[PDB]
């Protein structure tokens, strides 16, 4: 059932709040950094 | 990319924080062999210039003294010795008392 | 027939048809008045486009032949096929003088450098390889594409190679130092075909896009890319910017190239049409119902006013330009 819970959250919001934690969150922030720069936007703080 | 001595000398020359108004001494404490010291031939000469391969040339400020603290000169060439002021500290200078 | 302005016309000259399988690519001989066309039946048939008669078939490939190319002199013919091999044909005697292996999967493109001493190929293992013409040795391996590389095309002076791939991007590489000079991504689908810009077009492009004259005097190499999102984008390699997007094709763009005089853009697509684009005004002038099925490739002769187009209908068509 947890599979369906994660799918529910992902389909409804496009993101799982509890999926990235700890080092995963920092790594994801990294790839989002070069993704935004490498697309053309500047986003420094984590929330944007 | 600047090296240690190049970085120090460039920071002194730029004098962002009033370095030129000070007495800057750069003391090379260690062994002397031509490989690293011959690059200072223009610095210790009347040119007073450090020349980098990138074409940049750094002039020695009048308030900067280049000091070497060495225990021997069995490998230094005549070019380095002739370019510097010699001060000889015999072992008898510092007595056991 | 303005010597730099002819465009193809709906009345076809010949409809050459000897292939038993979809015709993949068609190229013109740089010197002789002869034309070459490879198909998926592992055959490379050679036709004379002045009188429209079959001459001879080059065989030896095991699987479908995907790309064929000539050198500057027109004496050697590099071909690659789906059987993971690249063959070099002595075009005077019509024998395969050398066969090259090394690609791990399907080889979907091949091109001879302008100097004529190296062959650059792109394969489904996401790699580009460089081979010596004399020895047939693999000497360089461009990696960095994340998907199947479809074509590779060097520029005029042979210092850069452009590669399109299923990874949505076109990568411009420096041959000397193997680095990735540029990575151009604006296509929303797979890029099929690319083409470089002839010198005689630079100035035109410079005033077509309104780009100001650089103080260097070189406007910068310009690249084109047709893609499966039914768009043909022309880029400035030097700045990495998409100078323009050309829209109007009804399906995947399979081939794209400049008019030899650098005033028009010739393209073909799976919408069964060959389109002539006035990139001065960023609009398509002419549309030809070239074939009765998908159009796969086209070539535009350097001097003579002829356009050769291959298609999946196993038919290669010659078009006089008036």
């Amino acid at each position: 059932s947890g599979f369906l819970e994660r799918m529910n959250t992902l389909l409804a919001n496009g993101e799982v709040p509890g999926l990235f934690e700890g080092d995963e969150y920092a790594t994801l922030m990294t790839q989002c950094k070069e993704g935004a720069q490498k697309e053309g936007l500047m986003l420094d703080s984590h929330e944007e | 990319t600047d090296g240690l001595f190049t970085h120090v000398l460039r920071k002194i020359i730029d004098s962002v924080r009033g370095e030129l108004q000070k007495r800057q001494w750069i003391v090379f404490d260690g062994d002397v062999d031509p490989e690293w010291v011959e690059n200072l031939n223009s610095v210790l000469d009347d040119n007073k210039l450090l020349t980098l391969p990138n074409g940049e040339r750094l002039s020695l400020p009048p308030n900067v003294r280049i000091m070497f603290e060495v225990q021997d000169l069995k490998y230094a060439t005549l070019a380095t010795v002739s370019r510097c002021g010699m001060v000889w500290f015999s072992e008898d200078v510092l007595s056991t008392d | 027939r303005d010597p730099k302005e002819w465009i193809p016309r709906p009345p076809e000259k010949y409809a050459l048809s000897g292939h038993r399988s979809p015709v993949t690519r068609v190229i013109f001989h740089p010197v002789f008045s002869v034309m070459v066309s490879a198909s998926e039946d592992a055959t490379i048939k050679v036709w004379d486009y002045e009188t429209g008669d079959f001459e001879r078939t080059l065989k030896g490939h095991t699987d479908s032949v995907q790309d064929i190319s000539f050198d500057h002199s027109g004496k050697l013919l590099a071909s690659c096929s789906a059987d993971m091999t690249i063959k070099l044909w002595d075009f005077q005697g019509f024998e395969c003088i050398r066969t090259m292996h090394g690609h791990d999967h399907n080889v979907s493109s091949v091109a001879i450098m302008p100097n004529g001493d190296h062959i650059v190929s792109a394969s489904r293992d996401k790699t580009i390889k460089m081979w010596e013409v004399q020895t047939g040795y693999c000497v360089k391996t461009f990696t960095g594409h994340r998907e199947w590389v479809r074509m590779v095309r060097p520029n005029q002076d042979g210092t850069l190679i452009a590669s399109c791939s299923n990874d949505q991007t076109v990568r411009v590489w420096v041959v000397a130092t193997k680095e990735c000079k540029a990575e151009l991504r604006e296509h929303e689908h797979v890029v099929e075909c690319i083409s470089w810009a002839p010198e005689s077009s630079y100035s035109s492009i410079s005033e077509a896009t309104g780009s100001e004259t650089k103080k260097s005097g070189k406007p910068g190499p310009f690249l084109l890319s047709g893609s499966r999102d039914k768009t043909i984008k022309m880029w400035d390699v030097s700045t990495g910017m998409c100078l323009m997007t050309l829209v109007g094709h009804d399906n995947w763009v399979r081939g794209v190239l400049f008019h030899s005089g650098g005033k028009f853009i010739l393209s073909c697509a799976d919408d069964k049409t060959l389109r002539v684009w006035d990139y001065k005004n960023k609009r398509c002038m002419k549309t030809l119902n070239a074939h009765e099925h998908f159009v796969t490739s086209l070539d535009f002769h350097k001097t003579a006013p002829y356009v050769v187009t291959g298609s999946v209908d196993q038919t290669v068509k010659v078009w006089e330009c008036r």
Binding site: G2, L4, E5, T9, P17, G18, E47 | - | D271
Partner: protein, 435 residues
Amino acid sequence: AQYNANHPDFPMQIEQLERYIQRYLVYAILWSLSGDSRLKMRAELGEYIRRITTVPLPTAPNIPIIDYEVSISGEWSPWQAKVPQIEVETHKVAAPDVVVPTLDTVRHEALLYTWLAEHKPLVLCGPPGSGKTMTLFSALRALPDMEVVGLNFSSATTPELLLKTFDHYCEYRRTPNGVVLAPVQLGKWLVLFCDEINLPDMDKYGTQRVISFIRQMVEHGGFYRTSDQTWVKLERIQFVGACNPPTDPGRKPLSHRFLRHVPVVYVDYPGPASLTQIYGTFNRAMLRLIPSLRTYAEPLTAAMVEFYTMSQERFTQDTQPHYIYSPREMTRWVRGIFEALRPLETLPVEGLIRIWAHEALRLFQDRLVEDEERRWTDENIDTVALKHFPNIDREKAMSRPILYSNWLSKDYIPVDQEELRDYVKARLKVFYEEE
């Protein structure tokens, strides 16, 4: 207080304050005691109040009191004064943000703003797709000092979902009075929009764990961090829930002890008049792309509404669980027609009717299970199109193999079956070798 701030020279006067307070008291009694019931029950409560009260009331013979707001001047004003017939931009036709003003929309907007401004938790109850999320977001646009964070409850939802949301969007800081959980950003209120609060399963002892957890955060203003058994006090956090009526399948009635803290507002499906107004506005905005078609805005919208109504009464959750029809399907209808109309420079009326029919088929027939219902849908689409659009080429607009594709052209245009078959065969031939 806001009025007095706006009028420093002329503070609020006692007689006008008394009038305002009386009218607002009647208004608040009405919107508190019947905000969670149908329109008929609101009218009944209004009639009872009119029959028993002494406060001055609107003199409209038939318009119920619930249609009147209390102006700051201290007099009743009809809500219709705040519902103008707007003209939406053609590029914002049926966009998710766009809300067409309506009597119900503005009333619920005002009530939601009134409750949210107090940071009081609330629940929006109504049929799925009625407009609860839209209404809440419209209310939150008028309050710049809140973010909404969306949580979607399910039958297996338990408090750890709220815990992860708090972990992401808030932090636990140590203060001398204890541990305080506060949003990472400052000055600005977090509002947790829990979309399915009454879906979480109820154990065999009549309790939903997440409902108890939310009740504990709401009443006691905090919870217990179970890692160290530490009481944590919430700061600058608000809860807003949405849910289908508890009588719907799979939904459980909420606990009364939880309900005493959360006022409930009932947002019903818009009536045929409201649907007509909203989607007539949308269609008028859309049809400006092709001027020659502008005169067909009023039938088409009506036609749409008519068909929608029949579907909503013909297919219900009694037959199949997914036979749910809402204004969301009409929003998708308008979006699809607009997308089909954008690249076309001109189009005869028969083509517009064909696009309408194709969108109706894709929205109302794809989910049908057995063949008879699909036959019913086809026949009734034909009948509705003929009824609202007479004197059109019946065959040219309702040629039965209705297929639309952009595979054979740059735009979304009707496609012949045989051409599409041949093209798909060729694409499959390529697909075999590539994939």
